[PDB]
Design a protein around this nucleic acid. Structure first.
Ligand code: ATP
Ligand code: UTP
Ligand code: MG
Ligand code: MG
Lengths: 1208, 501
RNA sequence: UUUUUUUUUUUUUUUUUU
RNA sequence: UUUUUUUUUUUUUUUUUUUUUUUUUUUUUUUUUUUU
RNA sequence: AAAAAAAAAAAAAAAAAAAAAAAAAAAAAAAAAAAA
């Protein structure tokens, strides 16, 4: 009944007695609510109040559990919290609360007459309180709370620790739970109407606090301070208090980093490699220290006194850099919730999207050349910030004008329009003029253009698009406001396509943009880690607060002038409905009207810049339709990413040129920009770099931007990645395991465990203790997402129950003899989590026959068929290599219960959430739509492909329509039509077909052995030769460059043995990647490759026309010829390991790097592909068992069946 | 081979002044063009509305080098029918595609011609002021040519070599067409009917033309009339065709009145005004608001009161109109009251011309602080000193928009827009594009243009003048032409075209 | 007197980020 | 020497579906249907 | 308009990484495995 008394709770090894016990107890939790309410609210827990122990750095802290009055005894609903204007069109202009104020649950009553304004408002507040709080990623919120609590219990082996008392004092209201969520009517039905309204979110809050406990960010003592701070923030409005003090509880680390004075940090190279360590001072400059006074007074006057005394504790009691790193992680986990932030759109619409004006105004440039409607064609600045930006971009106009010419823009429009998205809603006449099924699948952007493709060359549609409004669309994100972004239809997007294409080109000419270079590992922060190691540096991390609300029309004219100059130097005919011709035109100085040859794109940019409306429109269920104020940036356009990048780099580089022309130097070296976020790096004296920093800040205030200017000697922030002196401080408190933005059921549990693995793999090099994280992931896979229902035919209930209960526990329910199609809920065994096509989760040690255990799988372990190796690891693999056998010992495997998991994973019960997506979609209609859609760009490419496909049909064997470039748009519209008809069934359909195949397969059911799993069976033997370490293991001993890479930690020791990553030391690629899989980014399990290789087995006279049917270029043609030639020779072995790049963040990627640690006998090399394969074996094993080595060289044995398989 | 078929659609070319020669190889060419249009309209409507292979149709029609003959096959039957129809013409070269450079002509072009444009060099005919010029080859061959009769050129046709079947007649003698028809032997010919007048005005920089949507009998002017006489009908219906700054002013007489073609409004202006009217009529919307910008001096209030009266009488609801400088004239009185009156009638009562504005007082102090009191003192200054003074005025325009306070401007427009006694449909003028984030939220905002040289009109005001000119320069320097440009006849036509109830 | 390279198809779902 | 099943691989052929609400089902907009 | 019924349902743009591609049977053949 108690998890903390189990034998798994103290040995952490899956023996045969332990595994059944844990499986039984997790079944007990996942079945019924009564066991959950007895687990979370047992009477054996002694309620504690005072608790003393260590902090994150061993310093003694004393705390006290304190719950305020406003959570237990809420105030009644005050209607003045959400007031209205006197015309009642919207809320009050200056109103405090954008989120859910805490009040008593049953006090929210709608008593008014229906179809009245107050009735609408109280119905929407009801919808706020019930619907907008449930954000559950996997399952019921109580089961996630149970998973976190159970992980804490089985880890710490005791029940007395403060979070159980927080649960019993917040949520224990009677014998039942205060609330439950229901999928049928999607809300949170309360059962105690006297509970506080904010209290459902504290389920997720406690889940995040316990995730921080198992994470190792903060101990049991600091969780008291975190929960006291969080309960204090929910005294009046839980979200507004977190948004108010978000900046002040994080901007303290610079002062403590000053106070430690001197630290010993490593030094990076230019070429992504550690050289050495040095001891630099960490004192901030003199001008930064004038901000600490204002920050100290502000944090004294706004913050909470326990959190303030903790922040002063962290300032005083630090000695090294790592004390500041740990205390920064703790205050991150105390100030961030992790939950997504959501209310009604109308509340956050003011603070989200309303345009505002800051320090200075922006003026207009003089119009040199003017349209007959006096729309500006060519213009130029006299003096101002527009002159400063154009003095830099007028150099870049001329090469971009050459690059734009060589792009066929209609086919570029189609390949951009590939993205499926809503756009416009149809009217009534097209629903009768076009099939109703077409009106059904008309929710896609490519299908909308395929429907209205008959007027693509007609200029009237652009004037027609202005009558339609721009529908708003809300988004959530954790730890930020509810950003309300805009969403526009096809033609609004089409006007912003040519500015996107023109401003796209600047990235190739100038390096200063972080957009082209993203990789997911330490190649992304080579710049910041290199530049923080240098001397006399000044690091400025400038942010613009309110980017889109600051860009007015006149600020948008700066980007307009650059686009117009590039377009006027450009020469393209026939962009859209426009075409190159002569236009009457006005010029300054001339009195009459001239005639110039205007091309197509410059007409398009002129009509885009001239008719610019931004004001969005939301149709509220409260006020009717809400219009937005004009002057924002639209931020749903095509050019919504390049606009900010080009504007900001133009301002900064032009300020550099202006300071040079005024007799002043420029200390700037390199900058990076993605948009709203800018990295700046200066170098020189204090005076010169402070002057240049203040000058760039002044030019941003000249351009009308409210700027957030944090600058330091030894810190940098870009892309939510922070670096302090060659050291990556990750943000583990940013992502959340327990909330999703949208509520989605799990119809396929592979997709749930893939989501779980992808979320856990982001929490490796930003967590401090990955072992508790692995155990927490095991328990939220254990009890949270375990139950899978079933509905059998009522006749064959007991037969299916008598078959499938040999391998599983089927929770048999009551038959209904009155009504048919009864249900039999089952629970699936824990061995399913460890299997390929299953959970793919890392494993705890199992007991063999001998008593010797398997290797405890680390967090760096591979996935794929390398997870299928675990069956052979459960069998005594050294005994299997002893007497030359390959028998899997099905007694032990059925005893652990793996064969039931393989039976369920082969019979595909979980794969059948809808079981079919049928025909009669009228593919004649789809063929007509993609016939009328091909007629836009690059006529003549696809008719040739259809003729080649007909040739391959008529003389030899056919190709799939998937494979043909001409049938690609048919397949695209067809697959878009399949997603518009989606269904997920709550139960199952085991009706005589599934029953016949279950009866056929419920046999002895020995586990099948594919003959190519002989590569899995091999073992390594420990020698007594301690190997040398890499020399950079000595330099990263002082200050760990990640949270989990501390001195002695297993991540640090793997980084010592394997070594850091490098892009040049790639000795084996063509021989490594093929036995990994794909040849040259073309897979072997690619229908391209499969159909081509079936051609290649037959006569090759049909081969050039096969390429014409694909319409691939000549270089890729030669690559594919090499692919078949290299597959036909030694394409036997392949090993298929999946290894995430974020998981392998600082470590080496090339598996050759582990060859110096494993001694291989020379009599094993029998083929041209053994040297790569064996290195794959050794690399996966050294990453797999990194918690068990102590630095010793290995010898490898191989099984003779493996040698016979490799020879063949 | 024109874009719009002249044998089908004759009335549109009759509107341009182009008549058909009655019933030679040009006749055969124009009949073959009509048959090609009929065949294209059959083939394109058989599909969704797209031609199957537009470059193939374009080459077969334009070049005549492609002959599709099949001895799948069903995919090429549409091409083979066109190939036989082009083979049976025996032209030495293919037919060319002809487009006029006018917007009203392009809005009537069918969709299949628009598809054929992208794979064929057309023969685009430029227009002078909306009328296609008559010296071109295709118009001189196909259509019959005009002849201009003036007060000097007027004679019998037998003095010339004029004929009925080759020559059409356009008079601007001022005499009636019946008089010239029955007195001078012009019974057999055919006359061009125009509806607009094109007036060349004398201005300071030179002579200035003007296109007017009214008729010469309606707009009752004669050679030598003043500009202020019939000023309001000119303001409602006139458009200057010359480059700003034009020289039209209160001293302007005229030189000649000539009949001319009417103007056609743009698509975008009618689109934005139709979106505003859709917002007016609907009950889903609570508050409907239009924002109309103009340069300081364009004469926008005397038109927008008439516009509000038209919208009120046509929709039935009461339209409330806020003026251009209501905020300045309100802040001049209530800059010191703690809690002022945000009521609608109190704002509209303080809107007359005797009430001085706040910005005009501050700009008068800014002018006197540099020793400037006259127009001849201001114009004599160079540009850079003016830019310096305009930035000193921007430093006081920025102080009223930066925050939402009880004397601010965003709060003023909030409390006026969302009052209880305020009208539902409101119309608010502005002065610069930065004020749009301050003025109440809309979906529609336009920039208005009139027949005024705004720096010329501010030189002629009886009071002030220098402060008005300086504020005009600051405001023109603050707003560009980045919204839709809307003339007054476009707004009146947009009221007329909307069906009611 | 010979031997080695770094690469863009589509659909859906998830993750990081603007 | 013959036969029972898994898997490496070839050829042919069928080419294809059901309703059950365990659900404590939601709202307004529109085409049509029957009483008042 | 008071009432009853079938259906159409709402989630933009860019940079980067990982995973995925109907079922059942017959005819030819090897290994694993049971019987003789
Ligand atoms: N304290 C509670 N009080 C009342 N009803 C509850 C409570 N907790 C859950 N429920 C409701 O009781 C219903 C019973 O669901 P049922 O037992 O039939 O299947 P279930 O899916 O296993 O339940 P669960 O929602 O816990 O997963 C739940 O769907 C839920 O609507
Ligand atoms: O999904 C998105 C999100 C953001 N964006 C665009 O990138 C910018 C987001 O930039 P940031 O997310 O870094 O900051 P923020 O502006 O949203 O928050 P504050 O600084 O106001 O405190 C925004 O200006 C938006 O235009 C998108 O285009 N799509
Ligand atoms: Mg940012
Ligand atoms: Mg930002």
């Amino acid at each position: 009944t108690e998890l903390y008394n189990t034998i798994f709770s103290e040995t952490r090894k899956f023996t045969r007695e332990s595994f059944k016990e844990i499986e039984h107890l997790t079944a007990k939790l996942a079945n019924d609510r009564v066991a959950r309410h007895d687990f979370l609210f047992n009477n054996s827990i002694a309620l504690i109040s005072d608790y003393s122990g260590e902090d994150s750095n061993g310093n003694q802290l004393q705390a006290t559990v304190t719950i305020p009055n406003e959570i237990t005894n809420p105030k009644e609903y005050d209607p003045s919290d959400y007031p209205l204007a006197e015309d009642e069109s919207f809320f009050k202009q200056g109103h405090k609360y954008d989120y859910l104020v805490t009040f008593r649950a049953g006090s929210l009553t709608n008593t008014y007459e229906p179809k009245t304004k107050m009735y609408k408002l109280h119905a929407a507040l009801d919808k706020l309180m019930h619907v907008k709080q449930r954000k559950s990623r996997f399952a019921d919120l109580w089961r996630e709370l149970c998973a976190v609590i159970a992980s804490l219990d089985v880890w710490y082996q005791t029940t007395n620790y403060p979070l159980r008392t927080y649960v019993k004092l917040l949520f224990h209201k009677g014998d039942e739970f205060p609330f439950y969520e229901s999928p049928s009517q999607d809300k949170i039905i309360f059962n105690d109407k006297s509970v506080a309204s904010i209290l459902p979110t504290f389920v997720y809050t406690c889940c995040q606090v316990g995730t921080a406990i198992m994470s190792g960010i903060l101990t049991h003592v600091e969780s008291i301070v975190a929960m006291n701070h969080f309960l204090h923030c929910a005294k009046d409005s839980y979200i507004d208090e977190k948004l108010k003090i978000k900046g002040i509880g994080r901007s303290w680390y610079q002062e403590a980093l000053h106070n430690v004075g001197r630290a010993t940090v490593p030094v990076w190279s230019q070429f992504n490699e550690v050289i050495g360590h040095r001891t630099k001072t960490t004192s901030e400059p003199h001008f930064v220290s004038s901000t600490f006074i204002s920050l100290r007074a502000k944090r004294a006057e706004l913050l909470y006194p326990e959190f303030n005394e903790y922040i002063n504790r962290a300032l005083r009691l630090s000695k090294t850099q790592n004390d500041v790193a740990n205390y920064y992680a703790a205050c991150r986990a105390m100030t961030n919730d992790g939950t997504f932030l959501a209310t009604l759109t109308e509340l956050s619409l003011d603070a989200a999207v309303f345009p505002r004006i800051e320090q200075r105004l922006v003026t207009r440039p003089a119009v040199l050349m003017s349209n007959t409607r006096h729309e500006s064609l060519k213009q130029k600045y006299a003096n101002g910030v527009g002159s400063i930006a154009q003095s830099y971009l007028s150099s870049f106009t001329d090469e971009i004008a050459k690059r734009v010419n060589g792009i066929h823009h209609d086919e570029a429009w189609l390949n951009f329009l590939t993205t499926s998205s809503p756009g416009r809603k149809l009217t009534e006449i097209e629903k009768l003029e076009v099939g109703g099924d077409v009106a059904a699948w008309s929710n896609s952007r490519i299908v909308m253009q395929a429907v209205f493709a008959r007027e693509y060359r007609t200029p009237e549609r652009i004037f027609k698009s202005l009558k339609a409004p721009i529908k708003l669309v809300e988004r959530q994100q954790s730890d930020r406001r509810q950003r309300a972004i805009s969403g526009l239809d096809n033609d609004r997007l089409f006007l912003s396509f040519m500015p996107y294409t023109i401003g796209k080109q600047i990235y190739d000419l100038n390096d200063n943009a972080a957009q082209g270079k993203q990789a997911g590992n330490a190649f992304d922060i080579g710049e910041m880690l290199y530049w923080t190691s240098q001397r006399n540096v000044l690091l400025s991390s400038i942010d613009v607060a309110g980017m889109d609300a600051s860009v007015t029309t006149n600020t948008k004219d700066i980007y307009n002038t650059f686009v117009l100059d590039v377009a006027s130097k450009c020469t393209v005919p026939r962009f859209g409905p426009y075409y190159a011709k002569n236009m009457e035109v006005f010029e300054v100085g001339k009195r009459q009207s001239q005639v110039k040859y205007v091309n197509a794109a410059w007409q398009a940019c002129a009509l885009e810049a001239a008719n610019s409306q931004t004001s969005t429109s939301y149709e509220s269920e409260i006020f009717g339709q809400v219009k937005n104020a004009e002057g924002t940036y639209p931020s749903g356009r095509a050019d919504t990413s390049t606009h900010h990048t080009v504007l900001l780099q133009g301002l900064v580089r032009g300020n550099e040129l202006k300071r040079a022309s005024d007799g002043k130097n420029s200390c700037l070296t390199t900058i990076k920009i993605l948009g709203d976020d800018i990295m700046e790096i200066f170098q020189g004296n204090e005076n010169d770099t402070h002057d240049h920093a203040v000058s760039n800040a002044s030019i941003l205030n000249e351009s009308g931007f409210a700027t957030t200017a944090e600058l330091s000697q030894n810190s940098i922030v870009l892309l939510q990645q922070l670096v302090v002196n060659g050291t990556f401080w990750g943000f583990a408190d940013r992502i959340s395991l327990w909330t999703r933005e949208d509520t989605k059921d799990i119809g396929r549990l592979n997709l749930a465990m893939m989501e779980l693995n992808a979320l856990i793999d982001d929490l490796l090099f930003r967590v401090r203790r990955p072992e508790g994280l692995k155990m927490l992931g095991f328990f939220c896979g254990a009890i949270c997402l375990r139950r899978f229902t079933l509905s059998v035919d009522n006749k064959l209930y007991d037969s299916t129950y008598n078959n499938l209960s040999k391998y599983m526990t089927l929770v048999k329910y009551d038959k209904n003899p009155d009504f048919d199609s009864t249900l039999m809920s089952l629970i699936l065994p824990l061995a399913w989590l460890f299997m390929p096509r299953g959970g793919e989760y890392p494993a705890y040690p199992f007991e063999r026959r001998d008593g010797t255990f398997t290797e405890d799988e680390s967090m760096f372990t591979a996935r794929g068929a390398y997870k299928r190796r675990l069956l052979y690891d459960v069998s005594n693999i050294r005994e299997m290599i002893q007497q030359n056998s390959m028998v899997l010992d099905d007694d032990l495997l059925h005893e652990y219960g793996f064969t039931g998991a393989l039976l369920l994973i082969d019979l595909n019960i979980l794969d059948l959430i809808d079981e079919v997506k049928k025909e009669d979609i009228s593919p004649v209609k789809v063929n007509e739509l993609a016939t009328s859609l091909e007629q836009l760009g690059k006529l003549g490419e696809r008719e040739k492909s259809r003729r080649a496909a007909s040739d391959l049909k008529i003389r030899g064997h056919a190709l799939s329509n998937d494979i043909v470039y001409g049938y690609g748009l048919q397949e695209k519209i067809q697959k878009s039509a399949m997603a518009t008809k989606e269904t997920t069934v709550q139960s199952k359909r085991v009706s005589s077909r599934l029953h016949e195949v279950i009866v056929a397969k419920t046999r002895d059911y020995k586990i099948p052995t594919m003959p190519a799993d002989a590569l899995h069976l091999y073992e390594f033997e420990v020698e007594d030769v301690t190997v040398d370490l890499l020399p950079h293991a000595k330099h990263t001993s002082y200050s760990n460059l990640a949270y989990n890479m501390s001195f002695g930690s297993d991540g640090w020791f793997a980084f010592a043995l394997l070594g850091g990553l490098d892009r040049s030391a790639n000795l084996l690629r063509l021989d490594v990647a093929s036995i990994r899989g794909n040849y040259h980014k073309f897979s072997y399990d690619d229908p391209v490759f499969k159909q081509g290789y079936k051609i290649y087995k037959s006569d090759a006279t049909l081969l050039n026309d096969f390429f014409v049917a694909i319409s691939a270029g000549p270089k890729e043609q030669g690559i594919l010829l090499r692919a078949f030639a290299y597959y036909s020779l030694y394409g036997n072995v392949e090993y298929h390991y999946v290894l995430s790049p974020r998981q392998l963040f600082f470590l080496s990627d090339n598996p050759v790097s582990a060859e110096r640690l494993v001694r291989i006998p020379p009599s094993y090399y029998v083929s041209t592909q053994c040297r790569a394969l064996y290195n794959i074996f050794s690399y996966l094993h050294i990453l797999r068992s990194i918690t068990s080595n102590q630095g010793k060289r290995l010898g490898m044995v191989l099984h003779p069946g493996l040698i016979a398989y490799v020879r063949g | 081979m024109f874009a719009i078929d002249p044998l089908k659609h004759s009335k549109l070319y009759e509107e341009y002044g182009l008549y058909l020669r009655p019933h030679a190889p040009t006749i055969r060419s124009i009949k073959y063009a009509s048959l090609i249009h009929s065949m294209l309209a059959k083939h394109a409507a058989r599909h969704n509305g797209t031609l199957i292979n537009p470059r193939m149709y374009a080459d077969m029609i334009t070049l005549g080098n492609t002959k599709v003959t099949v001895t799948d096959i069903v995919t090429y039957k549409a091409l083979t029918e066109m190939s036989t129809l082009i083979e049976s013409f025996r032209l030495p070269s293919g037919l060319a595609l002809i487009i006029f450079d006018d917007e009203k002509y392009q809005s009537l072009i069918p969709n299949y011609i628009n598809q054929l444009i992208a794979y064929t060099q057309p023969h685009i005919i430029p227009t002078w002021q909306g009328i296609a010029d008559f010296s071109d080859t295709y118009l001189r061959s196909y259509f019959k040519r005009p002849f201009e009769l003036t007060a000097s050129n007027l004679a019998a046709p037998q003095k010339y070599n004029l004929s009925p079947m080759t020559r059409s007649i356009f008079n601007n003698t001022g005499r009636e067409d019946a008089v010239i028809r029955k007195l001078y032997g012009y019974g057999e010919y055919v006359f061009i009917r125009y509806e607009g007048c094109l007036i060349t005005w004398t201005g300071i920089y030179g002579e200035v033309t003007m296109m007017v949507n009214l008729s010469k009998r309606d707009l009752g002017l004669d050679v030598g009339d003043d500009y202020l006489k019939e000023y309001k009908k000119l303001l409602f219906y006139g458009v200057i065709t010359d480059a700003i700054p034009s020289g039209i002013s209160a001293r302007s007489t005229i030189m000649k009145i000539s009949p001319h073609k009417m103007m056609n409004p743009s698509g975008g202006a009618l689109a934005v005004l139709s979106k505003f009217l859709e917002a007016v009529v609907s009950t889903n919307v609570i508050n409907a608001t239009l924002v109309v910008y103009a340069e300081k001096g364009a004469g926008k209030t005397s038109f927008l009161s008439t516009y509000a009266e038209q919208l009120s009488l046509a929709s039935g609801q009461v339209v409330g109109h806020l003026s251009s400088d209501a905020y300045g004239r309100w802040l001049a009185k209530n800059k010191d009251v703690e809690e002022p009156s945000f009521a609608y009638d109190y704002v509209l009562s303080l809107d007359t011309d005797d009430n001085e504005s706040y910005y005009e007082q501050k700009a008068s102090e800014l002018l006197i602080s540099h020793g400037i009191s006259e127009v001849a003192q201001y114009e004599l200054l160079s540009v850079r000193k003016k830019i310096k003074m305009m930035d000193e005025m921007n430093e006081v325009l920025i102080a009223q928009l930066e925050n939402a306070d009880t004397h601010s401007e965003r709060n003023f427009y909030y409390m006026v827009s969302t009052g209880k006694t305020t009208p539902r449909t409101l119309i608010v003028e502005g002065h610069f594009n930065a004020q749009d984030a301050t003025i109440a939220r809309t979906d529609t905002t336009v920039l208005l243009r009139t027949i005024n040289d705004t720096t010329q009109a501010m030189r002629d005001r009886q009071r002030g003048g220098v402060v008005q000119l300086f504020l005009r320069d600051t405001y023109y320097r603050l707003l560009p032409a980045l919204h839709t440009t809307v003339y007054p006849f476009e707004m009146l036509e947009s009221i007329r075209r909307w069906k009611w109830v």
